[PDB]
């Protein structure tokens, strides 16, 4: 088989090369939160992403479903970006 030297030319790499933004160091999943006395990692197990839905007070039409819809729309936008970059 040939050598898969080809890589992803996604716009992010070009922007990072142009900008001075150094790549993230991937410190860890353990983010910190308040009012719980626990780390509650960002993503990986019962993270803060679902905390807004789990919490029983949304003081501000159902707003709980709107956050999930927004997250799904962001995921769809990421998928669209992946599809666009796949043509590179």
């Amino acid at each position: 088989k040939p050598l898969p030297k080809a890589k992803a030319m996604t716009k992010w790499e070009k922007f990072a090369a142009k900008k001075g933004i150094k790549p993230k160091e991937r410190a860890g999943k353990m983010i910190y939160d308040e009012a719980s006395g626990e780390w509650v990692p960002k993503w990986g197990y019962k993270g803060a992403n679902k905390k807004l839905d789990d919490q029983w007070l949304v003081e501000v039409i159902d707003p709980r479903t709107l956050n999930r819809a927004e997250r799904k729309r962001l995921v769809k936008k990421n998928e669209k970006q992946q599809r666009r970059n796949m043509k590179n």
């Binding site: 029983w56 007070l57 159902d62």
Partner: protein
């Protein structure tokens, strides 16, 4: 349980993530799996209105209105009886009246606050 707009309910809870417990209100909006209760807040001395949304799992009906209906029914019954009394207004707790107590029941004793 079944809930409808305008029903008076209390914010039940089963660390709490906030201190909104005990803020009674009236449900102004209902949906598939959520309800909306109106609550009042204030800054300084100026009262303000606040819209509040809660999960139905931690809401219970308010029993405050039951006393009013019971009093209305009692007043109606008193009025009906009057046709065959007066002064049907509620009376406050009156002070205790004089009474005689015999020492035979229990002779006074000394409890010696030494204590011991």
């Amino acid at each position: 349980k079944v809930y409808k707009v305008g029903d008076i309910v209390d914010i039940k809870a089963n660390m709490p993530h906030k201190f909104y417990q005990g803020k009674t209100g009236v449900v102004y909006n209902v949906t598939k799996s959520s309800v909306g209760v109106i609550i009042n807040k204030m800054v300084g001395n100026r009262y303000l209105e606040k819209r509040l949304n809660l999960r139905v799992e931690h809401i219970k009906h308010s029993k405050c209105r039951q006393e009013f209906l019971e009093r209305v029914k009692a007043n109606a019954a008193k009025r009906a009886e009057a046709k065959a009394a007066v002064q049907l207004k509620r009376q406050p707790a009156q002070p205790r009246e004089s009474r005689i107590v015999s020492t035979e029941g229990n002779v006074p004793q000394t409890l010696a606050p030494v204590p011991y």
